Structures are given as C-alpha cells and as structure tokens.
Amino acid sequence: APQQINDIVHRTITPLIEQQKIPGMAVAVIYQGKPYYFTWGYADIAKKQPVTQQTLFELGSVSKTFTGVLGGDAIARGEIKLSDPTTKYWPELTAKQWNGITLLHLATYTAGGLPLQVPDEVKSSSDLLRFYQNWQPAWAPGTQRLYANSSIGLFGALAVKPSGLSFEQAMQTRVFQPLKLNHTWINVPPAEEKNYAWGYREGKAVHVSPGALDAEAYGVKSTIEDMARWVQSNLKPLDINEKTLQQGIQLAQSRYWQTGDMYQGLGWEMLDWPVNPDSIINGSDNKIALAARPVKAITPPTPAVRASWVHKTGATGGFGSYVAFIPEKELGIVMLANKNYPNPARVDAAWQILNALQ
Numbered sequence: 001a002p003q004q005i006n007d008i009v010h011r012t013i014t015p016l017i018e019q020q021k022i023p024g025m026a027v028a029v030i031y032q033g034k035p036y037y038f039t040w041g042y043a044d045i046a047k048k049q050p051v052t053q054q055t056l057f058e059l060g061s062v063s064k065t066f067t068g069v070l071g072g073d074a075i076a077r078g079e080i081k082l083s084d085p086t087t088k089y090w091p092e093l094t095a096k097q098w099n100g101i102t103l104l105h106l107a108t109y110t111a112g113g114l115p116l117q118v119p120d121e122v123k124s125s126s127d128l129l130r131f132y133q134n135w136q137p138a139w140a141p142g143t144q145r146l147y148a149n150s151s152i153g154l155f156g157a158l159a160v161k162p163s164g165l166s167f168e169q170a171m172q173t174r175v176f177q178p179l180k181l182n183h184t185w186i187n188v189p190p191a192e193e194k195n196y197a198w199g200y201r202e203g204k205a206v207h208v209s210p211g212a213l214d215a216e217a218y219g220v221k222s223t224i225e226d227m228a229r230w231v232q233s234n235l236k237p238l239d240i241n242e243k244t245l246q247q248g249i250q251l252a253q254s255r256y257w258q259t260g261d262m263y264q265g266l267g268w269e270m271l272d273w274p275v276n277p278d279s280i281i282n283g284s285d286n287k288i289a290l291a292a293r294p295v296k297a298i299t300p301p302t303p304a305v306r307a308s309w310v311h312k313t314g315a316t317g318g319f320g321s322y323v324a325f326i327p328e329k330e331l332g333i334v335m336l337a338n339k340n341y342p343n344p345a346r347v348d349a350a351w352q353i354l355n356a357l358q
C-alpha cells in the first residue's frame with residue numbers, strides 16, 4: 001500500500017462517499033499490475049455488516065464486458081463469426097427486418113434501434129420470440145448506436161448456442177473458472193449469501209429483479225478481488241493460458257465503430273489515451289451514454305490499442321459500478337458501490353485517481 005496510492009484513493013473516494021451518500025464501497029487499484037484494495041461502510045446497514053474484500057456487489061452492465069469476452073471466446077473457438085446473420089443461430093427469426101442484421105450489430109448496439117430494456121411483460125421464451133419478430137428498426141443496420149440490453153443480451157444468448165451450454169455454464173467454464181474468478185456469479189449461491197451486499201434505492205434495501213436476458217446484459221455479481229483479477233486479465237491477456245480466452249479478450253477490445261471520441265468494443269468501450277477527462281466524464285452521463293448516435297464503421301476493426309482508456313459503467317436499481325484501465329500503463333481501477341449514483345461522479349473519481357498514478 002504505497003502512500004501515494006493510499007492518499008489519492010482516500011482523498012478522492014472519501015468525499016465521493018459523503019457527497020453521494022453511498023452506504024458501502026469497495027475500490028481496487030491495479031498499479032504496475034498489482035492490486036490494492038480499499039473498503040468503506042456497509043454491505044448491509046440493518047445487520048451492520050461491513051464491506052470487505054469478499055463482499056459481492058451487483059455489477060449491472062459491467063456484466064456486458066463478461067458477455068463480450070465470452071462471445072469473443074466463441075469466435076476464437078470458431079463456433080460463431082460476427083459476420084454471421086442473427087438468423088443462423090435463431091432460425092425462427094423469420095421476419096424480414098432481420099435480413100442484414102448480424103451478430104456484430106447485436107454485440108455493438110448497431111442493429112437499428114433495439115430498445116434499452118426487454119419489455120417487463122416478456123416473461124416466457126415465446127414472448128421473447130414474439131418481441132424480436134415484431135420489433136421494427138428505426139434505422140438501417142450499422143448506421144446508429146443505441147445502447148441496449150435487448151441487443152447485446154441477445155448476442156450473448158446466441159453466442160453460446162453452438163457450444164450447447166447454457167449461458168451460465170458457458171460463462172462459468174470458459175471465463176470464470178480459467179481466470180480463477182471463484183467468487184463471481186450469475187446466480188448467487190446460498191453458500192455466498194452472507195457476503196451478498198444489499199443495494200440501496202430511496203433508502204430501501206433491494207436486489208436485482210429477474211428479467212429476460214438479465215444474465216447476459218446485467219446479471220453478474222462479484223467481489224472487489226475478482227474484479228481486480230478481471231482487470232488484470234483484460235490488461236494483460238497474453239498471460240492467459242487458455243488460447244481462445246486470450247483471443248476473446250483481444251477481440252472484445254477491438255474497435256468496431258466510432259461515435260465522437262469513443263470506440264465500441266464487445267461490451268468494453270474505449271477512447272484513445274490520453275483522454276480528455278471532460279470527454280469521458282461528460283460522456284458517461286446517461287444523457288449521452290444512452291442516446292441515439294450515428295456511428296462510423298471502422299473497416300476493418302482496429303485491433304486492441306494499448307494506449308486506450310478502456311472502461312464500462314454498470315447499474316442496477318441498488319448498485320453502481322465502474323471499471324477503467326489503460327493497458328499501456330498497466331494501470332486500472334474498479335469502483336463497486338451499493339447505491340446507483342451518477343456516472344459522471346464515477347468517471348471523475350476514476351480519472352482523478354488514475355491520472356495521479358500514471
């Protein structure tokens with residue numbers, strides 16, 4: 001715990017916690033590749049349980065980075081290609097709007113206006129087929145980006161079809177286990193419930209609700225130690241012994257589309273480093289992050305650029321997560337909190353910390 005790391009982390013996060021009234025928080029800084037952990041406050045206010053390095057938080061949409069890497073791994077295995085039509089893996093998707101919509105489009109929110117959320121009324125598998133068959137794109141494929149669980153969530157579900165594994169089985173055996181993420185879960189097992197923090201929304205203790213494509217879009221729970229290891233793995237994929245997983249990580253950080261100063265990967269989003277902090281801080285606000293934006297194709301995609309700010313925000317009703325890292329500098333951060341507090345505050349704090357250490 002080098003004093004410089006201690007000081008910048010505490011001087012940044014303490015006021016953040018006060019300003020945002022965050023009940024509990026865990027932070028990991030990866031510095032020169034090694035992790036340093038910090039915790040504050042409560043995983044469960046009522047039961048007076050502190051946040052520890054073993055507390056599980058809901059990652060919300062940081063889960064999309066696992067989905068993107070799992071899909072990358074499936075590509076590397078030759079099970080799927082991003083150029084494949086969606087209908088190759090879901091032949092029942094016969095409606096004509098699907099002609100020309102590829103796995104790439106699903107993975108990268110560019111299918112033409114798939115919505116942020118699958119409707120809550122979608123309860124059954126037949127309900128889900130009906131939803132996608134009936135959905136009408138606003139835009140031609142590959143022209144506009146609209147951040148969407150219904151897009152990358154469907155990508156994740158289809159990416160694992162050739163394996164014959166469930167999404168959860170595939171994620172466990174192909175991503176979590178090889179990376180030794182032994183406290184990372186799509187479904188929190190009873191054995192780990194003592195460590196599962198409550199989220200807090202309007203003062204009420206809450207956990208994520210079941211929904212269609214939840215696992216694939218926002219359903220992972222993890223500890224600060226596993227998330228630090230996730231950052232390490234994404235910083236230095238060549239250290240990964242499993243070849244297709246190493247390659248999948250590289251594929252998820254490739255740059256497929258550009259909008260403004262941001263590049264869309266598979267789950268991960270990237271900017272060139274050094275970044276303008278106003279560009280990423282303001283860019284993280286949901287006023288921007290969730291907007292419909294024209295995209296420019298990167299033809300062909302640019303392989304993972306080491307001088308990148310690579311990051312992802314995540315939320316559920318009760319939790320707010322953020323991960324960012326810079327491969328060139330072997331530097332990264334994870335911020336896990338059990339309140340869904342504004343994205344710009346997350347990015348500002350992460351940038352203040354990483355810039356001071358870089």
Ligand SMILES: *[B]([O])([O])[C][N]S(=O)(=O)C1=[C][C]=C(C2=NN=N[N]2)[C]=C1Cl
Pocket residue numbers: 059060061062116117149207208209210217218313314315316317318
């Ligand atoms: B990701 O950007 O974190 C997804 N964001 S979201 O707006 O689609 C979303 C989906 C589902 C939930 C949820 N909370 N509790 N049950 N479901 C929250 C959010 Cl924030």
Ligand SMILES: O=S(=O)(NCB(O)O)c1ccc(-c2nnn[nH]2)cc1Cl
Pocket residue numbers: 075082247250251254255300301302303304
């Ligand atoms: O041209 S690509 O951008 N295509 C991306 B893909 O098919 O999802 C590409 C990028 C990186 C790599 C790679 N493999 N191992 N190391 N880099 C391969 C491709 Cl095809």
